[PDB]
RNA sequence: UCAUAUAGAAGAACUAAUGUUAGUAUAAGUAACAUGAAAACAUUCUCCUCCGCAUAAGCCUGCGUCAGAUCUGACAAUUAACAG
RNA sequence: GCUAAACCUAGCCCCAAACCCCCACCUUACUACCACAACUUAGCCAAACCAUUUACAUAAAGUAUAGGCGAUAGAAAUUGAUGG
């Protein structure tokens, strides 16, 4: 049975989508900048 | 209603300032100065000897 | 139902304001002015269309040439895409060969 | 006359990249964007493009 | 899966819940074995005055004259702070009139601010 | 002591209490530093009292009696803050001519944006700080493009605000 | 037109001038006025 | 330009693209869903569970009081010795 | 008779001109406080396959020239430049 692929975990969520992980690589800074440009108010998870 | 004053051509010689950046490359040099001399006479201010 | 019920407000046009009373004045500045000026030199409007005409492809090409380097990034990318598409269309699609 | 009327074609309207739903599975009409002229909020298939000039000059004698 | 609401100390697992403060200053440091040492110097000792005999109250009567907004400017302060001493001594080499050239040997440094409101 | 957290008991449940005028900036400027200190704490006690009263009213489902005193004391305390900060700033300019009390510098974030960075007083020098040298106070090339688009997105917003503001001037001159 | 209450200072005091201009902050002067004595000198920090 | 006509223009005409958006139908008041019993609303009785209590992880105020309704607002709360 | 049906502007599009702007925050971002580093567009697409190839002011001129001399590509010398 499927549908429960999201087993939430704050450590994982902050480690693999957080501000510092984005800022730790050029691609992540590009992601943050795209989301700054589009207007988002949730830049990083 | 009095019609607006007519559109008259830009009188005299047209000297564009050289320090500006938009003044194109071809409006400064010897050729434009030669054309202005040829078309407006000694009033253009070009020294003839440059020709 | 797609038709209005009350009458619209009356659009009052003043056929004798300054813009209409003086329309066309100086459209013979050439013939009646020793040819100092030309009628095109009274066309007020875009830098790249004053006194020139063409289909959309030529218009876009001209816009690119004359103000392409002043355009915003996204507008310029749209313009390049538009030229690419119009090229393909006008040169490969159509009833007439 | 310069006509200052522009209408966003199907490729100038925001978004619209992805295929909304697969072609075969569902029972809905095939569509390859949410911005076709067909769809609401899409682009005009044939509309006023850019500022258009209408200039032409008759022979001076005329 | 919630990313709009603020992130505060009430959110993560034990470790996060503990580490994240709540805007509260510190007053000490952790020693060995999760033991906390407090420092009497990093605790703000309030300095309250003696209010006895004071002839001023939270409000001011409606029978007070108005005046003009004249914000204190460096010139205005200098005018009546040191200038008259200069003029009195002008009738017959700057630290004597309150000038403080350097700010290492005083308790309340003006720049940077080493004190608190 | 704790009795001082509530107004004089004579004035409970009166729905009207008369208070004077909030101190104005010019009125404070005539007071010494000592008197401003004492005034500050008198206002502190009054503001605590009025906050208690307001919360109690909001708990009992009643309207606060004369809620203007609260804003009057808030304004008077802001005025006293302003006067003291002005004296401090004047003396700072005289004594060291600096503008801002807290040191800072204009830098570029990792996003290219020009920021004013306020310094955090630490104890070891900046080259030995493993945390402060993980920050990027510079901008690599890949941000320049995004620096342009932003500059454009905020020009459009300008233009639309200008053009519109003139259409509404034509309409206002066509009625 | 108006008579002041118990929490309203009289005009004699709200307009009195007791501010002799001085070259010391509020802190420096109040410390001396209330006789609280401090001698340890502030250390040196590294702003950045 | 007259001030419906003469001209000039053009996003210029939908019984049909498993078109798109919104409204309402049909199948249809059909398929399906729910509340153990009595009562004096205090209570008593019948029957059932690999269930329950706590920590962790997760969630973040999500049947506490009051006042409006058939859910909305206000007020209130979870006190370190346990754990970090 | 219900359901509805109707409306104007909030704004926006294209031009012209002018070069545009207290505290906390790179650790788990929005957390007062300890010993490395940055610097050739491939290909969808045309040739009805595909393999070399295939586009990113006016005039001279779609001329010279390039090219499975196919599809297509393509100069220069010189010329002169607030509005709807
Ligand atoms: Mg697209
Ligand atoms: Mg497709
Ligand atoms: Mg649209
Ligand atoms: Mg008709
Ligand atoms: Mg149509
Ligand atoms: Mg249909
Ligand atoms: Mg049936
Ligand atoms: Mg049934
Ligand atoms: Mg606690
Ligand atoms: Mg403990
Ligand atoms: Mg092919």
Swiss-Prot record, chain B:
Organ and tissue specificity: Widely expressed. Highly expressed in the thyroid gland, heart, lymph nodes, trachea and adrenal tissues. Expressed at lower level in liver skeletal muscle, kidney, pancreas, testis, ovary and stomach. Barely detectable in adrenal adenoma and papillary thyroid cancer.
Stretches the record annotates as Disordered: 1-22
Factors inducing expression: Down-regulated by p53/TP53 in apoptotic cells.
Localization annotation: Mitochondrion; Nucleus
Annotated Basic residues bias: 1-12
Signal peptide range: none
Protein family (similarity comment): Belongs to the mitochondrion-specific ribosomal protein mL64 family.
Binding partners and assembly: Component of the mitochondrial large ribosomal subunit (mt-LSU). Mature mammalian 55S mitochondrial ribosomes consist of a small (28S) and a large (39S) subunit. The 28S small subunit contains a 12S ribosomal RNA (12S mt-rRNA) and 30 different proteins. The 39S large subunit contains a 16S rRNA (16S mt-rRNA), a copy of mitochondrial valine transfer RNA (mt-tRNA(Val)), which plays an integral structural role, and 52 different proteins. Interacts with GADD45A, GADD45B and GADD45G. Interacts with NR4A1 via the NR4A1 AB domain. Interacts with ATAD3A and ATAD3B.
Leftover remarks: Cells overexpressing GADD45GIP1 were more likely to be in G1 and less likely to be in S phase and grow more slowly than control cells. Inhibiting the expression of GADD45GIP1 promotes cell cycle progression.
The protein's name: Large ribosomal subunit protein mL64
Organism from which the protein derives: Homo sapiens
Residues of the whole record sequence present: 25 to 75 of 222
From Swiss-Prot, chain D:
Coiled coil feature spans: none
Residue numbers bearing the Omega-N-methylarginine modification: 40
Name of the molecule in the record: Large ribosomal subunit protein uL4m
Region (Disordered): 11-42
TM stretches of this protein: none
Similarity comment text for this entry: Belongs to the universal ribosomal protein uL4 family.
Gene: MRPL4
Subcellular location(s) per record: Mitochondrion
Top-rank lineage group of the source organism: Eukaryota
Assembly mode: Component of the mitochondrial large ribosomal subunit (mt-LSU). Mature mammalian 55S mitochondrial ribosomes consist of a small (28S) and a large (39S) subunit. The 28S small subunit contains a 12S ribosomal RNA (12S mt-rRNA) and 30 different proteins. The 39S large subunit contains a 16S rRNA (16S mt-rRNA), a copy of mitochondrial valine transfer RNA (mt-tRNA(Val)), which plays an integral structural role, and 52 different proteins. Interacts with MIEF1 upstream open reading frame protein.
Swiss-Prot record, chain E:
GO biological process: apoptotic process; mitochondrial translation; translation
Subcellular location, record wording: Mitochondrion
Tissue: Present in kidney, liver, thymus and testis, and at lower level in brain and spleen (at protein level).
One example GO MF annotation: RNA binding
Alphabetized InterPro entries for the sequence: Ribosomal_mL41
Record key words, sorted: Apoptosis, Cell cycle, Mitochondrion, Ribonucleoprotein, Ribosomal protein, Transit peptide
Main location: mitochondrion
A GO term from the CC aspect: mitochondrial large ribosomal subunit
Function field: Component of the mitochondrial ribosome large subunit. Also involved in apoptosis and cell cycle. Enhances p53/TP53 stability, thereby contributing to p53/TP53-induced apoptosis in response to growth-inhibitory condition. Enhances p53/TP53 translocation to the mitochondria. Has the ability to arrest the cell cycle at the G1 phase, possibly by stabilizing the CDKN1A and CDKN1B (p27Kip1) proteins.
Xref: PANTHER family: LARGE RIBOSOMAL SUBUNIT PROTEIN ML41, MITOCHONDRIAL RIBOSOMAL PROTEIN L41
Family: Belongs to the mitochondrion-specific ribosomal protein mL41 family.
The protein's name in its UniProt record: Large ribosomal subunit protein mL41
Species for this entry: Homo sapiens (Human)
Gene transcribed to yield this protein: MRPL41
Swiss-Prot record, chain F:
Localization (cell): Mitochondrion
GO molecular function, one term: structural constituent of ribosome
Domain of life: Eukaryota
Keywords: Acetylation, Mitochondrion, Ribonucleoprotein, Ribosomal protein, Transit peptide
Positions bearing N6-acetyllysine: 82
GO terms for biological process, alphabetical: mitochondrial translation
One term under GO cellular component: mitochondrion
Family under the similarity heading: Belongs to the universal ribosomal protein uL29 family.
Subunit structure: Component of the mitochondrial large ribosomal subunit (mt-LSU). Mature mammalian 55S mitochondrial ribosomes consist of a small (28S) and a large (39S) subunit. The 28S small subunit contains a 12S ribosomal RNA (12S mt-rRNA) and 30 different proteins. The 39S large subunit contains a 16S rRNA (16S mt-rRNA), a copy of mitochondrial valine transfer RNA (mt-tRNA(Val)), which plays an integral structural role, and 52 different proteins.
Protein name, per record: Large ribosomal subunit protein uL29m
Organism: Homo sapiens
Lineage: Eukaryota, Metazoa, Chordata, Craniata, Vertebrata
Gene name for this UniProt entry: MRPL47
């Amino acid at each position: 049975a499927r549908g429960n692929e999201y087993q939430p975990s704050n450590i994982k969520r902050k480690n693999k989508h957080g501000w510092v992980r984005r800022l730790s690589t050029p691609a992540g800074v590009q992601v943050i900048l795209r989301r700054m440009l589009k207007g988002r108010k949730s830049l990083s998870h | 209603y009095r019609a607006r004053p007519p559109p008259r051509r830009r009188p005299g010689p047209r000297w564009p300032d050289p320090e500006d950046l938009l003044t194109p490359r071809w409006q400064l040099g010897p050729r434009y100065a030669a054309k202005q001399f040829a078309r407006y006479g000694a009033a253009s201010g070009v020294v003839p000897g440059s020709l | 139902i797609g038709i209005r019920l009350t009458l619209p407000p009356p659009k009052v046009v003043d056929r004798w304001n300054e813009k209409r009373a003086m329309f066309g004045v100086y459209d013979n500045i050439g013939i009646l002015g020793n040819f100092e000026k030309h009628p095109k030199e009274l066309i007020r409007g875009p830098i790249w269309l004053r006194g020139w005409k063409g289909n959309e492809l030529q218009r876009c090409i001209r816009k690119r040439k004359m103000v392409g380097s002043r355009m915003f990034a996204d507008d310029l990318h749209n313009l390049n895409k538009r030229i690419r598409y119009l090229y393909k269309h006008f040169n490969r699609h159509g009833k007439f060969r | 006359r310069i006509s200052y009327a522009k209408t966003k074609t199907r490729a100038e309207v925001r978004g619209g990249g992805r295929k909304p739903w697969p072609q075969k599975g569902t029972g809905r009409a095939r569509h390859g964007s949410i911005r076709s002229p067909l769809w609401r909020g899409g682009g005009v298939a044939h509309g006023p493009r850019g500022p258009t000039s209408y200039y032409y000059m008759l022979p001076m004698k005329v | 899966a919630d990313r709009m609401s603020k992130w505060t100390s009430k959110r993560g697992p034990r470790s996060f819940r503990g580490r994240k403060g709540r805007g509260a200053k510190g007053i000490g440091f952790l020693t060995s074995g999760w033991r906390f040492v407090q420092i009497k110097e990093m605790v703000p000792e309030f300095v309250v005055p003696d209010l006895t005999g004071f002839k001023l109250k939270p409000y001011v009567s409606y029978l007070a004259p108005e005046s003009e907004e004249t914000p204190l400017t460096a010139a205005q302060l200098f005018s009546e702070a040191v200038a008259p001493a200069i003029e009195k001594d002008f009738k017959d080499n700057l630290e004597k009139y309150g000038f403080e050239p350097t700010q290492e040997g005083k308790l309340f440094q003006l720049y940077p601010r080493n004190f608190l409101r | 002591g704790l009795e001082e957290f509530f107004d004089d008991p004579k004035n409970w449940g009166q729905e009207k209490v008369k208070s004077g005028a909030a101190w104005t900036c010019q009125q404070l400027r005539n007071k010494s530093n000592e008197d401003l200190h004492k005034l500050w704490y008198v206002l502190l006690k009054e503001r605590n009292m009025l906050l208690t009263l307001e919360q109690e009213a909001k708990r009992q489902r009643l309207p606060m009696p004369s809620p203007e005193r609260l804003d009057k004391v808030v304004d008077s305390m802001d005025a006293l803050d302003k006067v003291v900060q002005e004296r401090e700033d004047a003396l700072r300019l005289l004594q060291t001519g600096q503008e801002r009390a807290r040191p800072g510098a204009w830098r570029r974030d990792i996003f290219g944006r020009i920021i004013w960075h306020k310094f955090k007083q630490w104890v070891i020098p900046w080259h030995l700080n493993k945390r402060y040298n993980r920050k990027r106070f510079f901008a690599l090339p890949y941000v320049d493009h995004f620096l342009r688009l932003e500059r454009e997105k905020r020009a459009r917003i300008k233009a639309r605000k200008e053009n519109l503001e003139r259409k509404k001037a034509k309409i206002l001159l066509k009625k | 037109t108006w008579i002041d209450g118990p929490k309203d200072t009289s005009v004699e005091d709200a307009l009195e001038r007791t501010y002799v201009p001085c070259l010391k902050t509020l802190q420096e002067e109040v410390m001396e006025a209330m006789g609280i004595k401090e001698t340890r000198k502030y250390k040196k920090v590294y702003w950045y």
